[PDB]
Structure formats: C-alpha cells, structure tokens
C-alpha cells in the first residue's frame, strides 16, 4: 500500500466551456409532393390531393392549438376543407407563374392550354381557375394568401358542429383577424384596407361555390365506376365519409362576409 | 455631440472606429460603416456598422441581440431593437435616431407602427448599398464575405 | 491606449528585431491589460536579446504569477479569452467540442488525444488563456 496522490495531473475543468457550448444549426424544409400527369390529372389530382391533404394535416397540426382539437374533428376538417386548400394552393402558384391562366399543381407542374380545356380536366379545373383568377385580379400578397389558406382550413364543418368546436372557433377567428392585419399594413389609406379585406374575404366565401362543384366531380367519379377514376387511400376515406353529408346538405359552409 | 448627429462628411474613420468599439465593446475596429439620414415624410438618422468578425457563439453575446440602439427625439429607448432590421442582417451593429416614431414605446406599439416598418425597409436598403460598396473592393469584400 | 501601444511596437520590432525597448513597451501594455500570458512572452523575447534587461526580467517575473492570480471569476476568463479569435475558433469547431466533452468525462481521453499536436495545441491554447484548468 502507498501514499495516494492527485494523479494523473491531467484532471480538466471544462465547466466554463461546457456552459459556453449551446448552439447547433437547424434547418427548414420537411417534405415534398408533385403530380405525375397532365390531362390524366383527372385521376392524378386525387393522388396529389391525397398528398396535399396529408401535407395539410401536418401544416394544420403545426398551427398552435390545432393538435389540441379532438382528432375526430381534426380529421373532419381536413376531410371537408382539403378541396378548398387544394384549389387555393393552385391559385397562388398560378397567380405568380402563369398570370392565373393555368393551374399549377406543384411548383414543377403547370398544365397548359392544350390539356386545360379538355372536359376531363376543365369540368373540375375551371373552378380551380376561378380561384387563381381572383388572387391575380385581387393582387394578393403572400402574407394575405397564407392568412386565407389558413382560414380555409377551418371553413367547412358538420351542420351539427364539432366535438371540440369551441377551440376551433377561437382559432378560426384568430386567423380572420390576421388576414385583416396583413392587408392594413400593405395597402395604406383607409378605404383600401376595407376594400382589399372584403374583396379577399369574398374569395374565401366563394371558395365554397368552387368546392361544391369540385367535390361533386370527385363524389361522382368515386361512386360511378364508369368514370374509371382512381383515388389514394387518404382521399378514398375522406370521400366515402364526405359524400353522404355534403351532397345532402349536412355540412355547413362558413362565411366570413355577407353579400 | 453624439457621433450620429454630426455631419457624415466631417466624421473621420478614427472617430467611427472609437465609437464602434464603445458601442459594441469590441476591442477590434469595424469593417465598414454606413452613415446617412433622411427627411420629408419620414425623418431619422442612422449608423450601421459591419463588424470584422462574425458574432461568436458565447451565450453572453447572443442573449443581447438585436444590438442596434434606438433613440427617439435623441432619447435613448433601448438596446434590443427587435423588428428594426430583419434577422438575416442581425450582425450589423448600430444606432438609429428617429423623429417621427412616438415616445410612447412598448414592444407592441412598435410592432404595429407603420413608421417602424418604413424605417426598417429603408435601413435594409442602406445595408445593401453598403454591401455593394464593399463588393466593389475585391480585397475587403472577400474578408467580409468569408465572415 | 494599450492597444495602440501594441500596434506601433509591433511595427517597430519587425523593422528592428533587436530593439529591446520595442518589446518592453509592448509587453508593458499587455501586462497592464492583464494579458500576462503574452506580456510574459514578449518580455521573454526581450530577454532573449538581453537576459540582463530590467523590464524584460521584472515584467516577465510579475506576469509569471499574475497570469494565474488574475483568473478569479470565470466571467473574467470568458470575456478575455473569447476576445481572441483563436479560441473562438476552437470553441466554434464542433470537432473540438466533442473532444472536450470526452476529456471532461475521461482523463484518459486527454492522455491519448494530447499525443497528436493538432489537438494538443488547441488544448494548450485553451489552457494558456485559462479556459481549461488542469488539476
């Protein structure tokens, strides 16, 4: 046995340095989706709508308070709102990429005129073009656009309400106030704030007229095998759950402005 | 007199240098400075400095951002000027002295102020002008770019 | 204006490497600023030219003790050490951050890593500035 010692004489004190070490680099961008066809978007729109509604779920959950909504209602809202979110998403890209003449299904896919006017396309796409045309006529900013996309998310609910509706209502009203702010700080003057606000709001309200017709296409092609239209599992579940309620008037269209 | 209220043509590099060192507690000299003022429907004066080194990871430094001092009517308002300059440019150190912005300052008033919004876009444009001038100088631009 | 003393002393020294006074003036400014580690090194360069020189020898001996006696609070150490871009690089470099964590947890990590100068001198620099203490 030997006298002990403070060995090795190599015991570090990195404590002040460990307090210093904190930073790391974080990155943006989490997922991606495109269609793989043009006139055949008559079936690929559903594959895209599937991926876009799923993205819309991730996006919706990312908005504070959405995940605290009952799941049954979170899914009900995407089940009914996916159609306006899709048409509106096309709207923004169309507005900026083709001066709202063509629909832009993904940043990498624009369907041109030679396919755009075919009935398999146009019977549904003309309503999506209405939306693109209005964002362009209205000269919507990206902030104003996002406020509206966010508003559309909670715009279509059952006539009987939502299980956790009180939180949905607080979230939806926060969103409309945000649209107002996006406009007030951009147009200037007073008369232009209310005109830009109400004109953009009229698009949110008219999105329901767009949805009535776009959904009727999907409902009809979902049930009538004569149409030969394929759906992804996501929309197939949404559409079987949505048809008996939407076409029968059991779904309420929420408007943010009066006519 | 406050350096930023002095005439930009008379102020020397040594004067801006010492000011900067005191402003940022940076033992080293500044890389470049933009000094300008505006008047008319908006009036303010400002100094925007580019450091010779990128900000360091120490939390004692990071917790103090956004380090552009704000003065209103030459009254010191604050050291942390959120919403004054976009975050991507939050490496520029400086002083902004506004005349139109109200003295009734709270973070919320400032966030909702159209005056602050205009000042911010003007400061950005000036930052970009400074960067362009640096871009013309190949040797010093490279030093800047690396950081 | 100790900083300015350093820049003019450095040009003096490069022009005349044997001008012992250039070194004693520089070192005095460094000592005054409590940069005892470099002040000692500059005073020592002065001693290398003339080992009998009074400021070179006396300033050197004061720095020799003061460079440790001043550590006091870790805040002094962080503010002074992190002023130096070399240690900022050591700490901003994640490879060094990982090495340092192993070192805190295992004295043998130090025993082995310090055999390679690329790491040993990054560590030596952090020790020289007082960021890493060894017991």
Coordinates of N, CA, C and O in Angstrom, one line a residue, chain B residues 72-134:
Chain B
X72 N -35.2 58.0 -29.9 CA -36.3 58.7 -30.5 C -36.2 60.1 -29.9 O -36.2 60.3 -28.7
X73 N -36.2 61.1 -30.8 CA -36.0 62.5 -30.4 C -34.7 62.6 -29.5 O -34.7 63.3 -28.5
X74 N -33.7 61.8 -29.9 CA -32.4 61.7 -29.2 C -32.6 61.1 -27.8 O -31.6 61.0 -27.1
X75 N -33.7 60.6 -27.4 CA -33.9 60.0 -26.1 C -33.6 58.5 -26.2 O -34.2 57.8 -27.1
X76 N -32.7 58.0 -25.4 CA -32.4 56.6 -25.5 C -33.6 55.8 -25.2 O -34.3 56.0 -24.1
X77 N -34.0 54.8 -26.0 CA -35.1 54.0 -25.8 C -34.7 52.6 -25.4 O -35.1 52.1 -24.3
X78 N -33.8 52.0 -26.2 CA -33.4 50.6 -25.8 C -32.2 50.1 -26.6 O -31.9 50.5 -27.7
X79 N -31.7 49.0 -26.0 CA -30.5 48.3 -26.6 C -30.9 47.1 -27.5 O -30.1 46.8 -28.4
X80 N -32.1 46.5 -27.3 CA -32.6 45.4 -28.1 C -33.7 45.8 -29.0 O -34.8 45.8 -28.7
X81 N -33.3 46.0 -30.3 CA -34.3 46.5 -31.2 C -34.9 45.5 -32.2 O -34.5 45.5 -33.4
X82 N -35.7 44.7 -31.6 CA -36.4 43.7 -32.4 C -37.3 44.5 -33.4 O -37.8 45.6 -33.1
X83 N -37.5 43.9 -34.6 CA -38.3 44.5 -35.7 C -37.7 45.7 -36.3 O -38.3 46.3 -37.2
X84 N -36.5 46.1 -35.9 CA -35.9 47.3 -36.5 C -35.1 46.9 -37.8 O -35.1 47.7 -38.8
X85 N -34.5 45.8 -37.9 CA -33.8 45.3 -39.0 C -34.1 43.8 -39.1 O -34.4 43.2 -38.1
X86 N -34.3 43.2 -40.3 CA -34.5 41.8 -40.5 C -33.4 41.0 -39.8 O -32.3 41.4 -39.9
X87 N -33.8 39.8 -39.3 CA -32.9 38.9 -38.7 C -31.6 38.6 -39.5 O -30.6 38.4 -39.0
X88 N -31.8 38.4 -40.8 CA -30.7 38.0 -41.6 C -29.5 39.0 -41.5 O -28.4 38.7 -41.8
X89 N -29.9 40.3 -41.2 CA -28.9 41.3 -41.1 C -28.5 41.6 -39.7 O -27.8 42.6 -39.4
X90 N -28.9 40.7 -38.8 CA -28.6 41.0 -37.4 C -27.2 40.6 -37.0 O -27.0 39.6 -36.3
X91 N -26.3 41.4 -37.5 CA -24.9 41.2 -37.3 C -24.4 42.6 -37.4 O -23.2 42.9 -37.1
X92 N -25.2 43.5 -38.0 CA -25.0 44.9 -38.1 C -25.2 45.5 -36.8 O -26.3 45.3 -36.2
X93 N -24.3 46.3 -36.3 CA -24.4 47.0 -35.1 C -24.7 48.4 -35.3 O -24.2 49.0 -36.3
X94 N -25.4 49.1 -34.4 CA -25.5 50.5 -34.8 C -26.4 51.3 -33.9 O -26.7 51.0 -32.8
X95 N -26.8 52.5 -34.5 CA -27.7 53.5 -33.8 C -28.7 54.0 -34.8 O -28.3 54.5 -35.9
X96 N -29.9 54.0 -34.4 CA -31.0 54.7 -35.2 C -31.6 55.7 -34.4 O -32.0 55.4 -33.3
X97 N -31.7 57.0 -34.8 CA -32.3 58.0 -34.1 C -33.5 58.6 -34.9 O -33.3 59.3 -35.9
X98 N -34.7 58.3 -34.5 CA -35.9 58.7 -35.2 C -36.6 59.9 -34.7 O -36.6 60.1 -33.5
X99 N -37.2 60.7 -35.5 CA -38.0 61.8 -35.1 C -39.5 61.6 -35.1 O -40.3 62.1 -34.3
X100 N -40.0 60.8 -36.0 CA -41.5 60.6 -36.1 C -42.0 59.5 -35.2 O -43.2 59.5 -34.8
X101 N -41.2 58.5 -34.9 CA -41.7 57.4 -34.1 C -42.1 58.0 -32.8 O -41.3 58.8 -32.2
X102 N -43.3 57.7 -32.2 CA -43.7 58.2 -30.9 C -42.9 57.7 -29.8 O -42.3 56.6 -29.8
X103 N -42.8 58.5 -28.7 CA -42.0 58.1 -27.5 C -42.8 57.2 -26.6 O -42.3 56.6 -25.7
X104 N -44.1 56.9 -27.0 CA -44.9 56.0 -26.3 C -44.7 54.6 -26.7 O -45.4 54.0 -27.4
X105 N -43.5 54.2 -26.3 CA -42.9 52.9 -26.7 C -43.1 51.7 -25.8 O -42.7 51.8 -24.6
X106 N -43.6 50.7 -26.4 CA -43.8 49.4 -25.9 C -43.5 48.5 -27.1 O -43.6 49.0 -28.2
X107 N -43.2 47.3 -26.9 CA -42.9 46.4 -28.0 C -44.1 46.3 -29.0 O -43.9 46.3 -30.2
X108 N -45.3 46.3 -28.4 CA -46.5 46.2 -29.3 C -46.7 47.4 -30.1 O -47.1 47.2 -31.3
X109 N -46.5 48.6 -29.6 CA -46.7 49.8 -30.4 C -45.8 49.7 -31.6 O -46.1 50.1 -32.7
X110 N -44.5 49.3 -31.3 CA -43.5 49.3 -32.3 C -43.9 48.3 -33.4 O -43.8 48.6 -34.6
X111 N -44.4 47.1 -33.0 CA -44.7 46.1 -33.9 C -45.8 46.5 -34.9 O -45.8 46.2 -36.1
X112 N -46.7 47.3 -34.4 CA -47.8 47.8 -35.1 C -47.6 49.2 -35.8 O -48.5 49.8 -36.3
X113 N -46.4 49.7 -35.6 CA -46.1 51.0 -36.2 C -45.7 51.0 -37.6 O -44.7 50.4 -38.0
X114 N -46.4 51.8 -38.4 CA -46.1 51.9 -39.8 C -44.8 52.7 -40.0 O -44.2 52.7 -41.1
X115 N -44.4 53.5 -39.0 CA -43.2 54.3 -39.0 C -42.1 53.3 -38.9 O -41.1 53.4 -39.6
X116 N -42.2 52.4 -37.9 CA -41.1 51.5 -37.8 C -40.9 50.7 -39.0 O -39.8 50.4 -39.4
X117 N -42.1 50.2 -39.6 CA -42.0 49.4 -40.8 C -41.2 50.2 -41.9 O -40.4 49.6 -42.6
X118 N -41.5 51.4 -42.1 CA -40.8 52.2 -43.2 C -39.4 52.3 -42.8 O -38.5 52.2 -43.7
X119 N -39.1 52.6 -41.6 CA -37.7 52.7 -41.2 C -37.0 51.4 -41.5 O -35.9 51.5 -42.1
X120 N -37.5 50.3 -41.1 CA -36.9 49.1 -41.4 C -36.6 48.8 -42.8 O -35.5 48.4 -43.2
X121 N -37.5 49.1 -43.7 CA -37.2 48.8 -45.1 C -36.1 49.8 -45.6 O -35.2 49.4 -46.4
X122 N -36.1 51.0 -45.1 CA -35.0 51.9 -45.5 C -33.7 51.5 -45.0 O -32.7 51.6 -45.7
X123 N -33.6 50.9 -43.7 CA -32.3 50.5 -43.2 C -31.8 49.4 -44.0 O -30.6 49.3 -44.3
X124 N -32.7 48.5 -44.5 CA -32.3 47.4 -45.3 C -31.7 47.8 -46.5 O -30.6 47.4 -46.9
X125 N -32.4 48.8 -47.2 CA -31.8 49.2 -48.5 C -30.4 49.8 -48.3 O -29.6 49.5 -49.1
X126 N -30.2 50.5 -47.2 CA -28.9 51.1 -47.0 C -27.9 50.0 -46.7 O -26.7 50.2 -47.0
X127 N -28.3 49.0 -46.0 CA -27.3 47.9 -45.7 C -26.9 47.3 -47.0 O -25.7 47.1 -47.2
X128 N -27.8 47.1 -47.9 CA -27.5 46.6 -49.2 C -26.6 47.5 -50.0 O -25.7 47.0 -50.7
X129 N -26.8 48.8 -49.9 CA -25.9 49.7 -50.5 C -24.5 49.6 -50.0 O -23.6 49.6 -50.8
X130 N -24.4 49.4 -48.7 CA -23.1 49.3 -48.1 C -22.4 48.1 -48.6 O -21.2 48.0 -48.9
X131 N -23.2 47.0 -48.7 CA -22.6 45.7 -49.1 C -22.1 45.9 -50.6 O -21.1 45.3 -50.9
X132 N -22.9 46.6 -51.4 CA -22.5 46.8 -52.8 C -21.2 47.6 -52.8 O -20.2 47.2 -53.5
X133 N -21.0 48.6 -52.0 CA -19.8 49.3 -52.0 C -18.6 48.4 -51.6 O -17.5 48.5 -52.1
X134 N -18.9 47.5 -50.6 CA -17.9 46.6 -50.3 C -17.6 45.7 -51.4 O -16.4 45.4 -51.7

